[PDB]
Design a protein around this ligand. Sequence first.
Ligand SMILES: COc1ccc2c(c1)cc(C(=O)NS(=O)(=O)c1ccc(C(C)(C)C)cc1)n2CC(=O)O
Ligand SMILES: COc1ccc2c(c1)cc(C(=O)NS(=O)(=O)c1ccc(C(C)(C)C)cc1)n2CC(=O)O
Lengths: 272, 278
Amino acid sequence: AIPAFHPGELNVYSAPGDVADVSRALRLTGRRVMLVPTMGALHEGHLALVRAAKRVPGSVVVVSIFVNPPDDDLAQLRAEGVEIAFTPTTAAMYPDGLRTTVQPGPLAAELEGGPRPTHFAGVLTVVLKLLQIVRPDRVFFGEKDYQQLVLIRQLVADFNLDVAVVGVPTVREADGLAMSSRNRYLDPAQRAAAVALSAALTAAAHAATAGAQAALDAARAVLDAAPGVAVDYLELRDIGLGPMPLNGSGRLLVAARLGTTRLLDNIAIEIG
Amino acid sequence: PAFHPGELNVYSAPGDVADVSRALRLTGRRVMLVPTMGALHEGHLALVRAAKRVPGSVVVVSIFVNPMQAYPRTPDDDLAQLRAEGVEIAFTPTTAAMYPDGLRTTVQPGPLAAELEGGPRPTHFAGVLTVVLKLLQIVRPDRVFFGEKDYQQLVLIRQLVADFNLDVAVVGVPTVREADGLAMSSRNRYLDPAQRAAAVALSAALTAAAHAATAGAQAALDAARAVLDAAPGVAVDYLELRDIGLGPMPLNGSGRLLVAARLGTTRLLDNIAIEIGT
Ligand SMILES: COc1ccc2c(c1)cc(C(=O)NS(=O)(=O)c1ccc(C(C)(C)C)cc1)n2CC(=O)O
Ligand SMILES: COc1ccc2c(c1)cc(C(=O)NS(=O)(=O)c1ccc(C(C)(C)C)cc1)n2CC(=O)O
């Protein structure tokens, strides 16, 4: 007895079982199930994850809202033509507490996994679960938190998961600042200083025709031009986060403390 | 990829078996997984036979020696019995295909994996759960079949499925045992005449405790230990009485008795359902 699903309206489900049944029922009848996993507090970035998912012909869009340890968000999705919001409780995602989890590979130890050693294990575990519950054809992440997205690609390859992982370019303020829920915490000076991350990164990207060293130095110069910006790391890696090849396509990642607030950004880089 | 119905189809590439699996499924067939490490015996034939009796089922036996958790490797004998029981899919991946990037993303079992068999082998179950998961993801069966010999393993798998929300049913199958009670095992070939004989004491001891249990837990345990002690060259690694789910939950009326012993080199496991009272 398949749960009630009204096509073209916004259907909300809090029971995993329900969303799993609705979702399985929709695949069987043509629809391609797109998942956009969020933690609520939805901003334009999210919206651009949703929009991409709808571009896929015949798709139905699942947006989970789960706080991984408000009707305004439901309003945005309804106003976006989202047909499913999956809104489970913590006891429902975790009816037996933390038991079996995912152990990410060694890349979880670096970069962000320095300041936060266990964070990614948590991310990968909830992502596997959501992928299992919803079983989408495709799953949509912003490129902002880039390390996270790569580990997710590693989760999918490593466990032979059947989903396609789509990374959507990061949505930014007018001045380049990568969108983030933390942005509303920076006072004006900090907010104005924050502009340096993306400006460092864009500078690097364009400086890159002169090669690897000039990209890093361009970005480091820009970072240096800003007060109150404590850079935890600034690193050029290959697209999958191993060492940067002598020439080819890579990624440049930055992370920084503006007061209490930790900011991240990253960009694509071609060397030559 | 080709699928000849009513015969045995042997696929090497995960992709090959995932496509055929999915294809058969949409056309209404129900997919049954029997995960083996090969060297098939009468217990494996039971797993298959249970799988077969699920209506409109197609049966996939996987044969993979997962180097993450020495072993007898006998595919001709293995595949011969398979078409005899009328199995339609054998999945036989290479290590290359299963682990192209090596050990990377893995499964971390809960605390039950550090107990019992996990104490001296603390990365053993992570290996088991990892490859089981890979195998459920490759083949996407409706049900999956395990014998009950390796009981902790079964419970842990029930956990993998619950905690990761895998939509598959775990079917446990009663241990198939030799005429004298000895639990079927690939490790049995490794017992000489003296040891084969002594080995009967494991199943002997458990069935004695099943029956002494009317007198309580302490009597079931004492019974079972007495039989183990009266046995020549049987060194008991552990004998424990637990909840059926084996977990941080006390014993009440029903439970599970588990034993691990060594016959020289060869380590044996057995376990039994137990009712206290009853
Ligand atoms: C494509 O444009 C963007 C730009 C930034 C984005 C996003 C999209 C999406 C996010 C985001 O979802 N951040 S988050 O803290 O809500 C979040 C939500 C869900 C996860 C998991 C557990 C599903 C991986 C991680 C982070 N964020 C960062 C943020 O909103 O804090
Ligand atoms: C219902 O009858 C029985 C009785 C005993 C059984 C079995 C069935 C199955 C096994 C068994 O261990 N088979 S296995 O060694 O090939 C095997 C296969 C696959 C796993 C994984 C994939 C779950 C890790 C473990 C063991 N065994 C025990 C054994 O062969 O040692």
